[PDB]
């Protein structure tokens, strides 16, 4: 791919607005947003999670205006998780901070993950534990070995199905995703706040060091993404992921490319 | 609207200052300022805030001179938190931090937020829990369905009222808001400290990346805010919201449109 | 009218000094340290001792008489003085544990300073509207419950030593057009000091257009606040420890209409 | 050596692409990725930690295109922890958080440590006790004293060796690698959260205050890499080291030199 | 003096290279870089540290190549501290974070310093306490009053003497110190992580707003440290200070004085 010059004019730029949904599990019908319960397995051998349970990521695919070569190319993101007040409800049904205390808010583990591409972002898997047993209607590693809690470079896979790839199995391949930005931020630990800031003045810039960006194969743009908030504590002490759905506004604009 | 130039001359500028005071639900005559003591709801289905209990949105419409076309252009904003030192009072009916200890400072879930408008600030909707039974004096979102935990298109609203939209259920809508700018941020942890910072010497511009500032509508301009600083805890144990002033300082000019 | 500035070696001056905490000194050996916290049963009873409250600090420096020129505050290098001291964690503490070391000063905090031509004018917010303040303090009168959230009635300029309690009162963001002022408060029940010095840092105070604040009567005000959290001594008791802040400002003499 | 010109044209740069796995120290055949559960000595006398208890320094020699004079320049990297994700695996034989919680995520003491060099990366020894009694198949700082608790200069070494130098014994030699640029940091704390950040946006520029890269010596470049992420609990309370691979994409350039 | 030209030429500039270790007390032929176990005083009138529980400041006076009116001015700084992952030997005696887990690490007050000048770094002290009892062998604040709780502006002194120097009892002196560079923090919480960083590509200038770093009077540069890096925890329950060495490469170049 030869990438020229950028077509200017009115009809030159158009401009992509949605939201994604998280996809946590959505164990009943009053749920949506919420993961299962955790369980836990006895040994890493009977690991063996249900579907419900396991956060996947989101993956929007979004098609362009016809174009024929001309491409669709990304430029600028602008991002916010949508929802974030949501967290303040500390009155509904949760565990106590202490005797006559508030309800504990949503916090802990979290991912808050976007990717804004020009074709499928492509993962690469990644295994806690190889001999964990995912579930029928999930999309996981295959013949998984000992290798892969580290790295088995035979699980490669495209994120082309919503509600069916775990978040927990799959992370994107730095060996390849030339065609997408990705970002990504893993805050680990047992007692993390979630820390989650909206406005809409700030943007991100998608070009790479060349000055061009992502380019829209067959006029399609991908979105994905992860936003994993923490966990809510119900009034048992059972704890379930809480996600929320994040907005995206892509400006992007005609480029002409040869071959 | 095509926007043209800018006034100038010294009739060409004015400048909005003001407090907006918080709503936290004010439980009684004493305890402006607090919210009512949080109570736990035994099931999802069965959440069901009082009034009292539930923080709002703060907001002020504002008149400008008089115009006409021209419009007043929000330019520059300086803002901060009032009276960030009085959570230093650890010696008022707190619980102690242990046996013999001071009392334990208001601390935990805050969300900070404020945002500067030609128009009122435009919010959607997004449920906790879509089975709340939100109070009557509140305005929340209505026909609300489990697909309200993560995102319901119906639930579009104005920021119109004080004392009306609770925190809990709105937020700026991302689809909108082309007419204001708006910033916020959630620190959502049970032991989070608040850190509030105060200065003069701060300044926002509010100019989007063509130059062009909230413009005014009617002649009109919208401040909102929310600053709930996290939670007080009194002897007993119980919880409540404290929430805080914020002074806003706008400077805006004469723009003329099409 | 604020006109050009004066050059020559005789044009500049510079004014160094430290500005010692008030935390309340309950004892002849307590100097730095506020009265142990005790806790009211209620709002309505709330009635802290004099002893027990941090309060502003505040010095009025005389610069080199001048005459119209004004001395103009340009620069400012400043620092918490003394950040080693809360390595004592040797004297009198709560253990941190069963044949632990003491715990450390740490807690609430909130780390304050202004450099000025006039008074820091104060604007205040009660914490407890119905809180009885104690004889030898300077507090907001005529206090309602609006003076929990905005009583703009409780304006204040910060002109005495010991009086003005830190939990009262804050700069007037409405006022101190002639004044820099900078503060965090670090509210939380188990923040930790987080305490940086060097002789390398310059804070500006020059506003957007050029121009510091004017010295008044040839007079520069210094205000500062340094509560850096609260000492726990081995019966559980608290009580607030502040450290001194150093200030450096360089001035430049300004002509004005 | 003398550093002249830098070579032009297609045929004048090169890309290296790979990942280091961790040597965290593989306890039996399910269990790459992790230490040995974590045991603690009755005195510091008695140290002796096993080595599948130790994690170690990750290195590759890279081959690079024959050149020859010139040599190939290391230009930039980027780099990111692969597999991050796999620590929302709370379901997995872990401590529960509290009774009828889930399972307890990865954390505590890390060290994220990565370099790209010339040659070997060059080792300083510093030992928490002297007295440790490092385990056969390791390499660690011989004839060791009092005083290599703080620096002993005899330690020295080059990391040449996979599942060998182990991470707590050995660091760079801030008097020697000239010719590498190495970046680490040790996140020491018990209850530390990891904090992992991936994008493939991040670009680290390897160029030296001159504009000069790392010169790869025999056309070898070298990598290394340490990602202990924090302890995994098991169900008991027992506590292992966890690990992640890295990536690492590095760009040359031929440079003549003399 | 009248600050004049930089000499040029191969023979004008220098590099000093070392690294300073610290001084924590050094209770027992076994436990350099460790302070000895802490122990609480019953009331502030009875403080009375011994000297190997009191860590102190590092100094090293260094000489440079003879001049002679011309002087070394300190330029540019490299430092990090040495033996980071030493802090990952949480096998050694240590208390667990709970049943069966790991040993504790190194973690809660910290202190890490480090200055540059062409003359001794010049003290000013502050206590804590000032009825501490300081111990024979240190060099502490002499006449101590209540006022020495605050400031006491008669204790100043030179840091000129290694193991001597209480870091407790002394900090740099901002009314002095024209001719040296110095950076610190202290951490000072109970729980605090080190995060500690390490980087051969990192620089600091020295110089000042005017250009002139340094300016090493009869030939001589120092360098001075602390860098406490928190406590460790024996099983016991026992804490004691631990501190780790500081690497400094300077260089210098030749300026003339008039």
């Known amino acids: 791919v030869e990438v020229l010059e950028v077509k200017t004019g009115v009809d030159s730029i158009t401009e992509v607005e949605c939201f994604l949904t998280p996809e946590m599990g959505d164990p009943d019908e009053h749920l949506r947003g919420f993961s299962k319960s955790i369980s836990i397995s006895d040994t890493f051998e009977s690991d063996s999670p249900n579907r419900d349970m396991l956060p996947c990521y989101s993956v929007a695919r979004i098609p362009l205006p016809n174009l024929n070569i001309l491409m669709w190319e990304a430029v600028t993101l602008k991002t916010e998780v949508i929802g974030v007040t949501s967290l303040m409800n500390v009155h509904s049904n949760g565990q106590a901070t202490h005797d006559n205390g ?7 583990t979290s991912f808050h993950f976007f990717s804004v591409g020009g074709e499928a972002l492509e993962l690469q898997g990644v295994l806690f534990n190889y001999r964990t047993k995912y579930p029928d209607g999930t999309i996981f590693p295959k013949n998984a070995t000992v290798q892969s809690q580290v790295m088995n470079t ?12 775990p978040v927990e199995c799959w992370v994107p391949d730095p060996t390849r995703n030339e ?23 700030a943007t991100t810039v998608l070009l790479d060091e060349f000055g061009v960006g992502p380019l829209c194969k ?5 979105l994905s993404a992860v936003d994993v908030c923490g966990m809510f504590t119900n009034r048992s002490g059972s704890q379930q992921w809480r996600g929320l759905s994040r907005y995206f506004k892509v400006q992007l604009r005609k480029r002409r490319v040869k071959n």
């Open 179 to 201: 065609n997408t930005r990705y970002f990504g931020t893993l805050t680990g630990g047992e007692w993390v706040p979630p820390v989650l800031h909206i406005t809409n003045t």
């Open 102 to 108: 508030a309800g504990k808010p949503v916090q802990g």
């Open 154 to 165: 035979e699980h490669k896979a495209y994120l082309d199905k919503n509600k069916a790839y």
């Open 218 to 222: 067959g006029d399609n743009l991908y």
